[PDB]
From a paper:
The 70 kDa heat shock proteins (HSP70s) are an abundant family of ATP-dependent molecular chaperones, involved in many cellular processes including protein folding, prevention of protein aggregation, modulation of protein complexes, and protein transport between cellular compartments. HSP70s bind to extended hydrophobic sequences in newly synthesised and partially folded proteins, in a manner dependent on a cycle of ATP hydrolysis and ADP/ATP exchange. HSP70s consist of a conserved N-terminal nucleotide binding domain (NBD) with ATPase activity, a substrate binding domain (SBD), and a poorly conserved C-terminal domain which terminates with an EEVD tetratricopeptide repeat interaction motif123. The two main cytosolic HSP70s are the ubiquitously expressed HSC70 (HSPA8), and the stress-induced HSP72 (HSPA1A)3.
Numbering used by the authors:
A (entry chain A): 0 to 381
B (entry chain B): 149 to 261
The structure:
């Protein structure tokens, strides 16, 4: 059997999880069995098996009521928590009350089964551990696991418990903004206390955190954000733009044809990524609706206009976090970008102009920065 | 003609997608034969409903595989000069959509109440 391997860093995310390892003086972000550097935080229950990660996300359209995701939005919460009640109106899977605690309820191998959020997250963590072992060719037991800065005692404990159920020896639970600051070596910079703003914009979450680093100690000064603002909202604006354009060009409404909308949404998400490094993106979809070919393009300027209020709105939680931390924008020493949506040039421009032209910490892949810092912490604790 | 080496790259991508479509189409062909077999077969009625609803997982998997193919075809950008590629892309999308309509027919004949 396999030799004992190193300690790893795991960013256990809402929609995607990421695992890193510090080896040969650097962090290696580990690709999964499908070659992906992030793994969907998805668990599916079928008539014959349990699927985790990419294999679970890949069959979500075929088995929606038995494909669990967003377990992080439930972990460590009570059933009657405002967040649980609000989120369960949007999930296709059932959430039941078990003596005040939420449980996901699914059909598994023809039987009704219920699982606590930490059991679902333990399955995602088991997959992250296996991803590390498949790459290293060694057994992995030790890990640093990250959590949001706003997680209370119960949410932190439930995350630790998921790690324990997954067979991991959790070396430490550290905050996601702290892990991002660690990835950039912000604690190792010489001088007095450093005020750090972490700007975390993903596919479905926006979190601003202000930290003070003094003599290697991290203190969370404030947290602000928008729990459901992310990349998905920008894709929605692009889809609305193109549905309206098809109505103007062809006098046809494609919006009730689920497959035509999905084809358009997938092309939009891809065009949006193109717009972060090019000023224009082209889309060609043959026989989109009623045999009509849809050949179009969108400029970066048009994409920015469609989302202007949403991009501009990302500065409101920044001002709120600054107010709450009792700091002036001029007292921020470092700005860190986390989350794939921070790749948007207009978002970077607005944040840089707000901070009077100050350079942003963005060289580390924003989807990997948290796992990166966690893997640095894991090596230090080894 | 003015056939370019660059179009050969796009034609090769489309050929790979045609092969992938053929593999999914063979799975659909077996679903159609089993569906015809149940509709025109000698099973008793209660067993007929059950036998028909057992096709659900496979038909949904077939629909999803065809949708993934369409999304991959939708990543292609073919200049108007690449006429052969455009014709091949159009023919392939129409073939996948006709297969999706057959999948929808299977769905209309199973798990009914
Ligand atoms: N290059 C990019 N430009 C814009 N958004 C991106 C980019 N890469 C990833 N994202 C977005 O980040 C989110 C999390 O993966 C998704 O909404 C995704 O579309």
């Amino acid at each position: 059997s396999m030799s004992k391997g190193p300690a790893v860093g795991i960013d256990l995310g809402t929609t995607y999880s990421c695992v890193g390892v510090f080896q040969h003086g650097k962090v290696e972000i580990i690709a999964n069995d499908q070659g992906n550097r992030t793994t969907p935080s998805y668990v599916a229950f079928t008539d014959t098996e349990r699927l985790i990660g990419d294999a679970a996300k890949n069959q979500v359209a075929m088995n929606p009521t038995n494909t669990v995701f967003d377990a992080k939005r439930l972990i460590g919460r009570r059933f009657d928590d405002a967040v649980v009640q609000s989120d369960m109106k949007h999930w296709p899977f059932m959430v039941v009350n078990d003596a005040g605690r939420p449980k996901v309820q699914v059909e598994y191998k023809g039987e009704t089964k219920s699982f606590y959020p930490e059991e679902v997250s333990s399955m995602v963590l088991t997959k992250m551990k296996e991803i590390a072992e498949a790459y290293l060719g060694k057994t992995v037991t030790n890990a640093v696991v990250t959590v949001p800065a706003y997680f209370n005692d119960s949410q932190r404990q439930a995350t630790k418990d998921a790690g324990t159920i997954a067979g991991l020896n959790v070396l430490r639970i550290i905050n996601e903004p702290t892990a991002a600051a660690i990835a950039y070596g912000l604690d190792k910079k010489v001088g007095a206390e450093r005020n750090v703003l972490i700007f975390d914009l993903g596919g479905g979450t926006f979190d601003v955190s202000i930290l003070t680093i003094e003599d290697g100690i991290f203190e969370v000064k404030s947290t602000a954000g928008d729990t459901h603002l992310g990349g998905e909202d920008f894709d929605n604006r692009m889809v609305n733009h193109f549905i309206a354009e098809f109505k103007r060009k062809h006098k046809k409404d494609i919006s009730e044809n689920k497959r035509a909308v999905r084809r358009l949404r997938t092309a939009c998400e891809r065009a949006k990524r193109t717009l972060s490094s090019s000023t224009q993106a082209s889309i060609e979809i043959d026989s989109l609706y009623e045999g009509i070919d849809f050949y179009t393009s969108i400029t970066r300027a048009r994409f920015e206009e469609l989302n202007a209020d949403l991009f501009r709105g990302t500065l409101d939680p920044v001002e709120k976090a600054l107010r709450d931390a009792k700091l002036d924008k001029s007292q921020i020493h470092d700005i860190v970008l986390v989350g794939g949506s921070t790749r948007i040039p207009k978002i970077q421009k607005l944040l840089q102009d707000f901070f009077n032209g100050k350079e942003l910490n963005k060289s580390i892949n924003p989807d990997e920065a948290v796992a990166y810092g966690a893997a640095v912490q894991a090596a230090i604790l080894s | 003609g003015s056939n370019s080496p660059q179009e050969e790259v796009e034609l090769k991508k489309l050929k790979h997608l045609e092969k992938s479509v053929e593999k999914i189409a063979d799975q659909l062909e077996e679903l159609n034969k089993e569906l015809t077999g149940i509709q025109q077969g000698f099973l008793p009625k209660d067993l007929q409903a059950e036998a028909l609803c057992k096709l659900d997982r496979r038909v949904k998997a077939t629909i999803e595989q065809f949708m993934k193919i369409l999304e991959e075809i939708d990543t292609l950008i073919l200049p108007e000069n690449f006429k052969d590629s455009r014709l091949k892309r159009k023919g392939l999308v129409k073939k996948v959509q006709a297969f999706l309509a057959e999948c929808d027919t299977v769905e209309q004949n199973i798990c009914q109440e």
